[PDB]
Amino acid sequence: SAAIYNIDTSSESPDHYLVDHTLDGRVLFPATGYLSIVWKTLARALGLGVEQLPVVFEDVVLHQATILPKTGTVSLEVRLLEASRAFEVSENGNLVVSGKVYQWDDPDPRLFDHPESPTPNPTEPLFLAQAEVYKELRLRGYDYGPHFQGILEASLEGDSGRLLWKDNWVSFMDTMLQMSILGSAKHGLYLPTRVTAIHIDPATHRQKLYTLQDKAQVADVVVSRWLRVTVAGGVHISGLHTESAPRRQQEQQVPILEKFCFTPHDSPIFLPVDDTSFRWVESLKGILADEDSSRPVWLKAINCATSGVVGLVNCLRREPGGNRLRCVLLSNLSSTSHVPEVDPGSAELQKVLQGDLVMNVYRDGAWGAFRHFLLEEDKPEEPTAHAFVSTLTRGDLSSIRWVCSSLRHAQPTCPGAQLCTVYYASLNFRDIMLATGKLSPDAIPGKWTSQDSLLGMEFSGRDASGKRVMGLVPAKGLATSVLLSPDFLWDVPSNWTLEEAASVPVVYSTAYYALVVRGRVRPGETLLIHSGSGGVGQAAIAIALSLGCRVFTTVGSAEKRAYLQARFPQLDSTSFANSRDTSFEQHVLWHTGGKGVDLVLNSLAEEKLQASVRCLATHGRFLEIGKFDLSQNHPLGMAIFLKNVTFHGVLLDAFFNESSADWREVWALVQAGIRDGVVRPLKCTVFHGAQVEDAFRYMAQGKHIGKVVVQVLAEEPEAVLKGAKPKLMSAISKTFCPAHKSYIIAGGLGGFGLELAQWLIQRGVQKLVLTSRSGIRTGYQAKQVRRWRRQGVQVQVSTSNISSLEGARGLIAEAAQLGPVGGVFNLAVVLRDGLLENQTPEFFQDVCKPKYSGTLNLDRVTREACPELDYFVVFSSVSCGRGNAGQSNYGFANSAMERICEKRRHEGLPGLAVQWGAIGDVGILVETMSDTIVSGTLPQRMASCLEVLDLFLNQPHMVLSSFVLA
């Protein structure tokens, strides 16, 4: 009865294509693989083939992921309950997939009709090609191989496209899921966990498939987020639910990060490489012709201080004969104008020749070279008044640090939002779940970036005017300051303390919303509060006892029983039950006469929830404030509703999305309970802001009673202190940008350009000027730019070529039109590869014009008319630091950029040259070349690249490098 499927991903195995279903570097069994396997089991059970068996899956739950090992075989057992229409996929006795499967008796082709789009697509010519679709997906973390790369075309919105049919149901339905998650605003690796219904009718699937000019069978796919339905061919997927799988910390991208600083130490053929027309390149070719007399080739850069022949020599030494030519450079790169220029016709040149160093650089009287050093692993910390608590690595409370917040680098001022100095910030159970990784950051409603830390949901402190307030925030409450609407603030009473007030907002708002607004608790109603020792439980007890309600509370220990007895003397011995067992059901049903309770404020889970449901009386109100059974879609028997029972799903976090008068009702309830003495501060276990990690691991164990409070600022003795400024603490430096400043990315439409632009928007950039010679051509560029514009960012796609000084001047002009120029990023690149033999001075000019001349002009115009500039970053290559075969012009342009940035930083101006190794997921190496070893180094992924760039932007080093070794 148990159909066995030995999934082998060996080369000769029929299931070898499954190696291409790689998700975060792990070969996982697709959910559609389970669908096909259960389909095959049902077809054998009915004595048919899958192609002759139209099938319906219902309530498919994916309980765990099956990892397909590189060597071995995974055995999946499918058992069918035909009478109950159920199936079960298990692996080694562990339930993998459950749900209902049955033959579609009357298959309706009209089901597989594409739903109309809510809005017509204006950019019909602009779509996502297959390479673009899977570049975006691999950016999200889906490393789909060729067998699972079945999306040829997709619209920019991600609601329509085409899927190639390789006579494979697993791949086709997986590409269905890929197209479903392609038009997703949420970022990260989202995996299917539930599907409400899947109808596969292979008969109409054969009809829906059509052949293109490529002779490849394809099918139109449509995703409707309004109807929650994906249709393609003869497959219909309704109610697909995906949860964000936390990306594994065992990432092989541990980049080598390095620093580039000037470090003091036959017949010679001298070549002046200082000419701006690159006419010497052909001359260098002549020097490469000879063998004996070409041993002392001395290329000297005397005139220009930012010539950058270092990368030239580094790249030419790798060419055949480069070492034999012994290319030795003399770079007179004087950082300051007061330093005397070394005469190359004097004894200094003879001394340099006697030294025979591969590279000689003169810097302010020092004759040295350019060497690579290891970058310090200590994270840059700065003294700021605006910081937040964040877990650097998810799931690890040890990696809990204060990081500079977006309020430090961008101070906002607008009505309807108030900046309050946080003196005390309360931990909540959701904060513990976030910091321990048990809860995904995306599960919290709101617009949160990937780098955003959502720790902290409630605080107390002082507003801008100095008034002593306490506030409730959706997130970012565990900070030195909070930007929140004044609608979520209460005045702290005179008798209260800020320490005390920090425990009221979340807990009492939740209790008031649940009991009064939702539960509509009336005086004298019997009521069961679960975990009455906790914050929300204690508040619910206070509210109920203010109304003279009989309270049955469940506590997990006798000490919590004693605390609740002392705190609420209205509770008697029969008020208390166990929360760690189901016996609270028996206690309640006995002490209530078998009737039940009028309300159940429930945070318990699984069977403990079901027992809580069995504690309900007639007309009982079950207020579910827990999330586990809700998030797991656990079944609730509906017979309880025969008791006139109301079931509330109570989520206070819904009040931060609309903030209408519905929240003001709960606010007024809390304020009234404050003035009536009903709302009373809970017990607060206080950890100082210097040790927030200990607060987290303390509250994680659960021995706490009441509220854990992190004191960010000690409450000074005063009612309304006019200052109200946060004290300066050392927090990890993080790159953030003012919303009033404009930021330019020259070459911002490229792979790294678009990724950097998105990263900058995530860092507060609101005015972007991306420059490209050709403008927006690809559908990926259009989708990214239109998404940023819809998000509210002024993204200008400029054509102003920075190669010309007039072009850079006009570019700075269009940037300043939006706002003062805060940053410029030189990512413009053109490539004219090839060895020195087949190299042209025109090729050198073409390659250096975006980099050499581009950075010349950017530096000049920023010096002239950019007083508020904070960032001057250029993207150089590792081919500059070490050298690449047949990339001499690339290295020369990159070294010129580095010299420019060093010269800028020497005068105190912002300057940064990032030597990037092989860049992954996007760029020129991804398009031209193919996780392939390039020059001994792996392509660094974007996530790692942006992390390293964030680190580099907070360093004092002119030039740093990042590359992942193989």
Ligand X SMILES: NC(=O)C1=CN([C@@H]2O[C@H](COP(=O)(O)OP(=O)(O)OC[C@H]3O[C@@H](n4cnc5c(N)ncnc54)[C@H](OP(=O)(O)O)[C@@H]3O)[C@@H](O)[C@H]2O)C=CC1
Residue ranges of the binding site for NADP(+): 527-544, 742-757
Minimum CB separation of residue 670 from a copy of itself in Å reads 18
CB 255 within 8 A of CB 963: yes
Shortest Å distance, C-beta 799 to a copy of itself = 38
Is 4 one of the binding residues for a copy of itself (CB under 8 A)? no
Q: Is 180 in the site for a copy of itself (CB under 8 A)?
A: no
Closest listed residue to residue 236, CA positions, set 56, 49, 36, 37: 56
Report the distance separating Cα 749 and Cα 827, nearest Å: 9
DSSP 479: B
Q: Does 48 bind a copy of itself (CB under 8 A)?
A: no
| Cα torsion 758, 193, 131, 222: sign | negative
CB of 232 to a copy of itself, least distance (A): 17
Please tell me the number of Cα atoms within 13 Å of 115 on its side-chain side: 18
Q: Segment contacting a copy of itself (CB under 8 A): 30-38, 262-270, 417-425, 639-647?
A: 639-647
Q: Identify whether 21 is a catalytic site residue.
A: yes
Decide: is 875 part of the binding site for ligand X (CB under 6 A).
yes
- Three-state secondary structure along 3-38? EEEEECCCCCCCCHHHHHEEECCEEECCHHHHHHHH
Residue 633 in the binding site for a copy of itself (CB under 8 A)? yes
Taking CB within 5 to 8 Å according to partner kind, which of a copy of itself, ligand X, none is near residue 774?
ligand X
Contacts of 784 (CB under 8 A, 6+ apart): 754, 757, 758
Annotate 834-869 with three-state secondary structure. CCCCCCCHHHHHHHHHHHHHHHHHHHHHHHHHCCCC
User: What is the C-alpha to C-alpha distance for residues 620 and 632, in angstroms, rounded to an integer?
Assistant: 24
Q: Which is nearer to a copy of itself, 299 or 652 (CB)?
A: 652
In the shown chain, the binding pattern of residues 822 to 841 toward ligand X, with x for contact by CB under 6 A and - for none, equals -----xxxx-----------
Q: Work out whether 918 is an interface residue with ligand X (CB under 6 A).
A: yes
Report in angstroms how near the CB of residue 824 gets to ligand X at its nearest.
12
* Contact string (CB under 8 A) for a copy of itself, positions 206-245, x = contact: -------------------xxxxx---------x-x----
Kindly state whether residue 877 participates in binding ligand X, applying the rule CB under 6 A. Answer: yes
Is 249 an interacting residue with respect to a copy of itself (CB under 8 A)? no
Given ligand X, a copy of itself, none, residue 916, with its beta carbon under 5 to 8 Å by kind, binds: ligand X
Tokens of 135: 């570049």
Considering beta carbons, is residue 197 or 848 the nearer one to a copy of itself? 197
Catalytic residue among 20, 143, 174, 629: 174
**Binding site membership: which residues?**
527-544, 742-757
| Residue 638 binding partner per list ligand X, a copy of itself, none, with a CB distance cut-off of 5 to 8 Å that depends on partner kind | a copy of itself
Question: Are 296 and 328 contacting, i.e. CB atoms less than 8 angstroms apart?
Answer: yes
- The residue within the footprint of a copy of itself, chosen from 49, 67, 69, 81 (CB under 8 A), is 81
Cα(591)–Cα(576) distance, integer angstroms: 11
Residue nearest to ligand X according to CB distances in the complex = 750
Q: Based on the shown chain and the rule CB under 6 A, indicate whether residue 801 belongs to the binding site for ligand X.
A: yes
Exactly one of 306, 711, 771, 778 binds ligand X (CB under 6 A); that residue is: 771
Q: What distances in angstroms separate CA 765 from CA 418, 451, 819, 881, one per listed residue?
A: 21, 14, 11, 31
Binding mask 508-547 for a copy of itself (x = CB under 8 A): ----------x-----------------------------
- 218, containing H or E segment: strand 217-224
**116-155: contacts with a copy of itself (CB under 8 A):** 118
Find, among 194, 162, 167, 166, the residue nearest to 178 by Cα. Answer: 162
- Count of residues binding ligand X (CB under 6 A)? 28
**Which of 95, 686, 929, 933 forms a contact with a copy of itself (CB under 8 A)?**
95
* Interacting residues with a copy of itself between 828 and 887 (CB under 8 A): none
Choose which of 315, 422, 744, 919 interacts with ligand X (CB under 6 A). 919
Report the site for ligand X in 747-766 (rule: CB under 6 A). 747, 749-753
255 binds ligand X, rule: CB under 6 A: no
Q: Strand, coil or helix: what is 67?
A: strand
* Pairwise CA distance, residues 157 & 225, whole Å: 11
CB of 592 to a copy of itself, least distance (A): 8
Query: How many CB atoms are located within 10 Å of the residue 328 CB?
Result: 20
Told to check if 746 binds ligand X by CB under 6 A, we report yes
Q: Are 508 and 488 in contact (CB under 8 A)?
A: no
Query: Which residues, listed in sequence order, are joined to residue 148 by a DSSP beta bridge?
Result: none
Q: Supply 162's token pair.
A: 């085409």
Q: Say which residues have a Cβ less than 8 Å from residue 442's Cβ, sequence separation at least 6.
A: 186, 188, 244, 448
Rounded Cα–Cα distance for residues 598 and 547 (Å): 14
How many CB atoms are closer than 10 A to CB 346?
9
Could you tell me which of 380, 256, 306, 367 has the C-alpha nearest to residue 957? 380
Sign of CA dihedral 711, 715, 719, 725: negative
Contact between 421 and ligand X per CB under 6 A: no
Taking the least distance from each CB to ligand X, the nearer of 231 and 770 is 770
Which of 4, 558, 639, 719 touches a copy of itself by CB under 8 A?
639
Query: For a copy of itself, which is the closer residue by CB, 210 or 590?
Result: 590
Which of 210, 270, 373, 641 is the binder for a copy of itself (CB under 8 A)?
A: 641
By CB under 6 A, residue 869 contacts ligand X: no
Does position 953 bind ligand X by CB under 6 A? no
Contact between 850 and ligand X by CB under 6 A: the answer reads yes
Q: Shortest gap between Cβ of 952 and ligand X (angstroms)?
A: 13
Taking the complex as a whole, the smallest distance from the CB of residue 391 to a copy of itself amounts, in Å, to 24
Q: Which does 184 bind (CB under 5 to 8 A by kind): ligand X, a copy of itself, none?
A: none
DSSP designation for 70: S
The CA-atom distances, in angstroms, between 783 and each of 123, 636, 743, 755, 786 are 10, 42, 20, 13, 5
Q: Which of 178, 451, 803, 845 binds ligand X (CB under 6 A)?
A: 803
User: Is 174 tagged catalytic?
Assistant: yes
Per-residue burial over 814-836, b if 16 or more Cβ lie within 10 Å, else e, is: ebbebbbbbbbbbbbbbebbebb
* Residue of 8, 15, 21, 386 with catalytic role: 21
Please give the residue ranges that form the binding site for a copy of itself (CB under 8 A): 1-2, 59, 79, 81-84, 86, 88, 90, 93-96, 98, 115, 118, 194, 196, 225-229, 239, 241, 518, 585-586, 589-590, 593-594, 614, 618-619, 624, 627, 629-651, 654, 662
Residues that bind ligand X (CB under 6 A): 746-747, 749-753, 771-774, 801-803, 827-830, 850, 875-877, 916, 918-919, 923-925
Q: Annotated catalytic sites, by residue?
A: 21, 174
